[PDB]
Amino acid sequence: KVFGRCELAAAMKRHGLDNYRGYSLGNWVCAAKFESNFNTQATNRNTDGSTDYGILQINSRWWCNDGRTPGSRNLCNIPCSALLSSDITASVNCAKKIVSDGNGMNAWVAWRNRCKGTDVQAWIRGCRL
Ligand code: NA
């Protein structure tokens, strides 16, 4: 599914991401925009052979099992295909584990490079939340 901005904002808010570990909702929406373009089905392969899955482009080396990433931890205890669902529950629950991991949202390279230190409130402006 390709989310609309406000639609995703509302879903992320419902799943407890607004202010999760101190990151306002706008951060999460920004990160989803530049990671996946709001498309739950986005995949992208890395040079290391791992792949990133879903709206938040969660990586198969650490976080999910895709059956093809040797010596990967599956710290979210999920098949990586669960991350591509139109229901973002799994992506959100895994993202909460990642963000808790000690590097915060810097784990998301597009967040660091395109959202961090910008006016991220702009990503939820106009939305009914
Ligand atoms: Na893995």
**All domains of the chain, ordered by start, with CATH?**
1-129 (1.10.530.10)
Joined together, the tokens standing for residue 52 give 């990133």
What resolution in angstrom units was achieved for this structure?
1.7
- Diameter of the chain measured on Cα atoms: 44
Q: If we measure between CA atoms, which residue out of 69, 71, 73, 45 comes closest to residue 57?
A: 45
Q: CA angle 80-83-84, nearest 5°?
A: 105
C-alpha–C-alpha distance, residues 118 and 45, integer Å: 28
Burial category of 35 from C-beta neighbours within 10 Å (exposed 0-12, middle 13-18, buried 19 and up): buried
Angle subtended by helix axes 25-36 and 5-14, to nearest 10: 130
**What is the Cα Rg of the chain in Å?**
14
CA dihedral 102, 51, 34, 8 (to 10 degrees): -80
Angle at 107 between CA 128 and CA 47, to 5 degrees: 120
Cα 68 to averaged position of ligand 1 atoms, centre (Å)? 8
Contacts of 125 (CB under 8 A, 6+ apart): none
Does residue 119 have a known ligand-binding role?
no
The alpha carbon of 71 and the centre of ligand 1 are apart by a number of angstroms equal to: 7
To the nearest 10°, report the CA torsion of 118, 124, 125, 129: -150
| Structural tokens at position 120 | 């991220």
Q: Tell me whether residue 35 is one of the annotated catalytic residues.
A: yes
| Cα–ligand 1 centroid distance for 58 (angstroms) | 10
Active site residue 7: no
Instruction: Select from 96, 90, 87 the least CA-distant residue to 77.
Output: 90
